[PDB]
Amino acid sequence: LGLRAVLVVAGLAVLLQLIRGWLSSKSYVFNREEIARLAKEHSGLDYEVAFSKIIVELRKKHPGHILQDEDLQWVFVNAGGWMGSMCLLHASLTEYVLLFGTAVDTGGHSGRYWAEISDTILSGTFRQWKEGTTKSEIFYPGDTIVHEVGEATSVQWSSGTWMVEYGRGFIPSTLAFALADTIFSTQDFLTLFYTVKVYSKALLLEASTHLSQLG
Amino acid sequence: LGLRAVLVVAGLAVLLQLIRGWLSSKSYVFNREEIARLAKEHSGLDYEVAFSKIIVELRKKHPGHILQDEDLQWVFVNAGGWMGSMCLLHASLTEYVLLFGTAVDTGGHSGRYWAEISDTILSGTFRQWKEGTTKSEIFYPGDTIVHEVGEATSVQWSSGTWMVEYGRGFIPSTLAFALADTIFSTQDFLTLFYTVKVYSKALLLEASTHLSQLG
Amino acid sequence: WLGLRAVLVVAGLAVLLQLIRGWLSSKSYVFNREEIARLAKEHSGLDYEVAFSKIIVELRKKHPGHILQDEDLQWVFVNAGGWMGSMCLLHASLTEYVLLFGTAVDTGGHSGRYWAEISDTILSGTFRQWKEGTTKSEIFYPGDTIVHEVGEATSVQWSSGTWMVEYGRGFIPSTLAFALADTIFSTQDFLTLFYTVKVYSKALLLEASTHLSQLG
Ligand SMILES: O=C(OCCN1CCOCC1)C1(c2ccccc2)CCCCC1
Ligand SMILES: O=C(OCCN1CCOCC1)C1(c2ccccc2)CCCCC1
Ligand SMILES: O=C(OCCN1CCOCC1)C1(c2ccccc2)CCCCC1
Ligand SMILES: CCCCCCCCO[C@@H]1O[C@H](CO)[C@@H](O)[C@H](O)[C@H]1O
Predict the structure, then answer these.
(1) Which helix (H) or strand (E) holds A161?
(2) What backbone torsions phi and psi does residue A138 show, to the nearest 5 degrees?
(3) Where is this region: Important for ligand-binding (chains A, B)?
């Protein structure tokens, strides 16, 4: 009838306005400024000591929203042509906090999702190459890169680069990316299992905490 | 004697020989020596100044075969395990001219297609590792690398490496490669959309110029 | 009982794994990790090509009929786990393989995770290994030997011109997927895939014909 297609894009737009109003009106456990300031506070000492102190601070300020020491493990992350490792501390459907970094020189595509991802370097260097330009920037400990919603860059990390990462938005929209290189390159399905496990642990902790505070 | 198998073999051989004869007896808008000399002439300037001057020269010598300024945009190129960026100026089924390069350190497979691809460096370095050897060669501004037909090499580019590229042959035979990393790694389908858009704009410009000559 | 069928599948997989593991534990092998490691470190002070030739000659002398001749040796590109190198296969069976590996460009990525132990003795260059579960990597130089253990997955990195002698023992088919992924979902270099299939078929047929010659 020459009209049906306008109704499908209108239904997707209704869904998008619904989700956008929800994400703009929702309450969040953390904010990117809090995580960025906490990470920049310990940017002067060793990155492992910084990891420990930031974990302690996050468990103190937000009890029931951070995994315990028995649930912390380093999991390899192969995505977008790069390879690093993560230690997940918090994860819901709209938020995640983790410690990211690499001990090797890597780089590739940063991904493009419906979420905002901030990274505060604890040690090393962080080269970001934004879209549409011919020049990149290097960020140092204390600085923070804000991978905006819907924008795609090229990331490059030198050996020994470690940072604290906070993401807010629609978290599932990232999942595919985080697994792509594992499905079509590394074939390390044990790491896939580890990732699914730690994500499930964080989600279950968050759900049980929501159950407890309601009653 | 199996008849359908022999017929398939003979038909595919006749099709390949037909395409080969058409490529051997076809007229072309550019040649690799033209693009290479034009790029080497301006290789001593800043690569952005060189970009401007090379675009102006290409539009002067070949009017109606280069996209206008409102249609030029930098689109990411993830392929063969490396990540760079392109600005497509011309593209047909048998030719393409573009500005390629990266602002990060990358490298990977060069691909292996039925087309000859020449790259003249305006800035940076270009490490080529030919097939069947244990040593590579570094190339500097002014040099021209010819990725030959059916040949596969290893490419590596340092941060800030920019070059002018001309490809001639059966251009569609590259498409799969050019999209592989996008489908199974980056999942950046908006960059895929940009690539499809610019390639379609170039093909439409070429068909429009073909129509303008006849009437 | 649907649980009966799933338990049957689990028990069958378990008995097959146990059968293959017992066979690997009770099998005789042509080479060992220490042999290849010491032989490569012996020539690790020369240029990597002179070392290549000397190691090939010594290996063909000590184990005749188990290593390809000069007419079957060729360099084949190897894209895997996000890194790109080159290999020259000298020996390969279902449980063993010996080859020369290395890269002329700076590369790195996932090391893979298979049911086989893979040793690499550096003849030239540098080898950065990043073990799983740690936040620090380690660089190894010519003369050193890296042991990619069974079931472990690391991050590998090699600088331009790094060359080594590789020996793998275990269930070699368990590597096939990792060896082909980048070719299927990235490089599309099916001619390099053909070359890989060709050299491995040559090696397998060499092993089979050598075993037939022993019996008659
Ligand atoms: O842990 C990650 O990767 C950080 C690396 N950074 C690099 C810079 O760009 C953003 C991602 C991601 C994750 C993995 C698993 C659970 C939750 C999140 C976060 C989104 C990006 C890929 C996967
Ligand atoms: O834009 C590109 O990439 C140049 C980079 N070069 C670097 C040297 O080796 C060949 C590729 C390609 C393209 C393909 C199709 C349309 C428009 C552009 C050209 C072929 C290689 C990948 C895709
Ligand atoms: O020949 C290879 O490539 C060695 C590369 N090495 C480098 C050091 O780390 C381990 C892998 C492999 C292969 C290629 C082709 C067919 C069957 C196997 C052997 C298993 C490990 C990867 C792929
Ligand atoms: C990636 C971690 C740092 C590696 C050493 C880089 C030293 C400076 O490198 C420079 O960085 C600039 C911004 O990216 C670019 O303009 C230059 O092309 C690049 O040479």
Answers:
(1) strand A161-169
(2) -110, 130
(3) 92-99
d(CA A137, CA B111): 29
Domain A29-214 sits in CATH at: 2.60.120.10
Q: Which residue has the tokens 């030029």?
A: B72
Q: What is the DSSP string of B41-77?
A: HTTTS-HHHHHHHHHHHHHHHSTTSS--GGG---EEE
d(CA A89, CA A71): 9
Measured CA to CA in angstroms, residue C30 lies from B66, B91, B157, C164 at distances of: 63, 56, 42, 20
- Which residues partner with B123 through β-bridges? B162
Ligand 4 surroundings by CB, under 6 angstroms: A 125, 127, 135-138, 156, 158; B 159-160
The answer, yes or no, to whether any atom of ligand 1 lies below 6 A from the CB of A77, is yes
Strand order across the C138-140 sheet: C107-110, C155-158, C127-130, C138-140
For residue B104, the tally of other CB atoms under 10 A from its CB is: 23
Instruction: Report the side by side order of strands in the sheet with B161-169.
Output: B75-79, B82-91, B95-102, B161-169, B115-123, B144-147
CATH of C31-215, one of 2.60.120.10, 2.40.10.10, 3.40.50.2300, 1.10.260.40: 2.60.120.10
Q: CA end-to-end span of chain B, whole Å?
A: 52
Using CB atoms, pick whichever of B129, B133, B181 lies closest to residue C186.
B181
Output the DSSP codes for C53-121: HHHHHHHHHHSTTSS--GGG---EEEEETTEEEEEEEEEE-SSEEEEEEEESS-EEEE----SEEEEEE
Contacts C48 to B, Cβ<8 Å: 134
The 10 Å CB-count burial string (b at 16+, else e) for B24-50 is eeeeebbebebbbebbbebbebebeeb
Rg (CA), chain A: 18
The token pair at C7 is 């338990």
CB pairs under 8 A between B and C: 82
Per the CB < 8 Å rule, is C112 touching A186? yes
- Beta strands C83-92 and C76-80: pairing type? antiparallel
| Nearest residue in C to A48, CA atom | C135
Residue type at position C42:
E
Contacts of C109 in chain A (CB under 8 A): 78, 83, 106, 185-186
H helix intervals, A62-188: 172-181
Query: For A135, which residue in chain B has the nearest alpha carbon?
Result: B103
- The CB-side HSE value for A98 (13 A sphere, CA atoms) comes to 25
**Dihedral pair phi/psi, residue A32, rounded to 5°:** -65, -30
Resolution (A): 3.1
CA dihedral B36, B37, B38, B44 (to 10 degrees): 100
As a whole number of Å, the CA-based R_g of chain B is: 18
Whether the CB-CB separation of A178 and A77 falls below 8 Å is answered with yes
Cα(A139)–Cα(A40) distance, rounded to whole angstroms? 13
In whole angstroms, what is the distance from residue A110 CA to residue A118 CA? 12
Experimental approach taken: X-ray
CA distance C160 to C40: 20
Ligand 3 atom nearest to CA at C87: 1
Neighbours of C65 (CB within 10 A): 13
User: What tokens appear for C73 in the block?
Assistant: 């040796």
